[PDB]
């Protein structure tokens, strides 16, 4: 008789998910192919604070023996992800961020923690952007970035990926911002394609200036990463109709599905750990007091196959098969699905780019 796992699931209040379904979530899967049994304890939150989070986690740990934690909220911050990383590093618990502020990717995690997230990295976003550009025979482009962190690695990855094809790219220039020193920079661009990299509050101004000078219209394709197109239905007054952007699939991927996927991943990792060494690690006694050196779950989830699909991670906390999608801002002024990323090849639905005109 193998043992069973105790998993704690914390979810946001404003997700239209009842607490009964959380503890009856095994019914839809009928335990599926789960190697081990799971006892689920369900807790609901509305908005998290640095002290409320800690109190909740320590109270959960005191009551019973905890083997995992699936966290998903509705607050949109990166401080929540940082706090989850800190708590995991301090208590030796595997934590999965699946939705909300936890799902936001963060680089250079602490090497003694076990925090993993459901999200795509900037390198993968650049990969899909380059794939779409190559698919629409846009072999000439330009790069416009700002001082916002990540631009160095973005540019480096762009160059390295550019230099290696049977296509033959024709990159033009790399303009960086540090009207008396940037007027020059904005006067040296002609290529239709313009890959931008900044925040929204700077993108609005850059795009407005480009429009007012004459960088918008029929043939001027602006592509921006998921950082510039974040919260949907918050479109500013000046975003041209015909933008192309990448975003994580929030239209067909459901919370009920991703919680079940996280449970499957944790169960498979624990089963692999038990098979090798005959014990499953757990959390410590309590938060308040005064290092698990043998083994951790940090090596048994290098590859994990569950229910056919490969749910494995990488060595840095990234997925191998993220569910990225491609969106466009159509005439009715909202983002619309235009293409899907799956396996290693995108699948567009138009196959010849329609003409989107901006600003009437």
């Amino acid at each position: 008789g193998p043992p069973a796992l105790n998993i704690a699931v914390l979810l946001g209040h404003s997700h239209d998910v009842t607490e009964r379904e959380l503890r009856n979530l095994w019914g839809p899967e009928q335990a599926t192919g789960l190697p081990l049994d799971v006892n689920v304890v369900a807790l609901l939150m509305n908005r998290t604070d640095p002290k409320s989070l800690i109190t909740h986690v320590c109270d959960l740990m005191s009551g019973a023996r905890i083997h995992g934690l699936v966290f998903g909220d509705d607050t949109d911050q990166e401080a929540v992800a940082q706090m989850l990383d800190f708590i995991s590093s301090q208590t030796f618990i595997p934590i999965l961020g699946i939705h909300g502020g936890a799902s936001m990717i963060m680089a250079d995690k602490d090497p003694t923690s076990t925090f993993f997230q459901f999200g795509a990295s900037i390198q993968q976003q650049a990969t899909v952007m380059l794939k779409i550009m190559q698919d629409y025979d846009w072999h000439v482009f330009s790069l416009v970035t700002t001082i916002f962190p990540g631009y160095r690695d973005f540019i480096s990855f762009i160059k390295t990926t550019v230099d290696n094809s049977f296509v033959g790219w024709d990159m033009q220039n790399v303009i960086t911002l540090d009207d008396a020193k940037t007027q020059v920079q904005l006067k040296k661009i002609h290529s239709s394609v313009i890959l931008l990299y900044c925040s929204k509050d700077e993108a609005v101004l850059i795009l407005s200036e480009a429009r007012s000078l004459g960088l918008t219209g029929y043939d001027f394709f602006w592509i921006v990463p998921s950082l510039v197109s974040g919260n949907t239905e918050l479109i500013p007054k000046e975003f041209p109709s015909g933008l192309i952007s990448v975003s994580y699939d929030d239209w067909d991927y459901s919370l009920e599905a991703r919680v079940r996927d996280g449970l499957g991943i944790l169960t498979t990792a624990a089963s692999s750990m038990l098979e090798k060494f005959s014990y499953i690690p757990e959390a410590k006694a309590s938060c308040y007091g005064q290092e698990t050196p043998l083994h951790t779950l940090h090596q048994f989830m290098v590859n994990v196959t569950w229910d056919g699909k490969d749910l494995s991670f990488t060595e840095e906390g990234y997925q191998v098969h993220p569910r990225l999608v491609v969106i466009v801002l159509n005439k009715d002024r909202e983002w619309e699905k235009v293409g899907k990323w799956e396996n290693q090849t995108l699948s567009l639905r138009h196959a010849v780019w329609p003409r989107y005109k901006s600003f009437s």
Partner: antibody
Amino acid sequence: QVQLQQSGAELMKPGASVKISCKATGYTFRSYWIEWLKQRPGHGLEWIGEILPGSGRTNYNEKFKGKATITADTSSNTAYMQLSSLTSEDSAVYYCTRSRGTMITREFTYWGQGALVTV
Amino acid sequence: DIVLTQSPASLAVSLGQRATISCRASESVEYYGTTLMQWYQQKPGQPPKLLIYAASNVDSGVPARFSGSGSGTDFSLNIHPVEEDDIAMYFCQQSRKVPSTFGGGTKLE
């Protein structure tokens, strides 16, 4: 089936130290925690500490901290309890118990016979 | 910790009707919808035996005459009918806080 067995009775001129064994012959000895309890002459029970043989982690009670040492031997499937500096208050019966890892509570299911130490 | 209390210390009941035992705790033991309370039976000279776990679930392999219910901080256990089984002591144990604590016991005749 899971079975636990302990040593016999003990007796010692005051001032010695005692060691008690508990053997498991029905499961994977390195997966389930083992707990030790004390029972005085018929007025209650207490809790000393627990040991996980697979990883070697140990936790104790502050009342019995520094008095009882819990050790395990993964080869002979024996759990060892080391009481030191016996006094007149250490005449009691002890049990080794192990739960079943299928529930959310922390209960005791399998019990040994128990050994009566006398000072 | 959590300090339990059992009343009455000694109980004397006729054979046939029923027996009732109460065990009230100092603090609440509920843990996200699952109260943590266990009842034990200990014959003289023998290790105890688990009867009820989680304060409402009976244990497989035990007679159906045993049953327990309660929530919050007040808990109870009632057995019916009375037979030659209820000649031992009974205890209550909480597992909400480390370390675990037991009751004081209660005899029957």
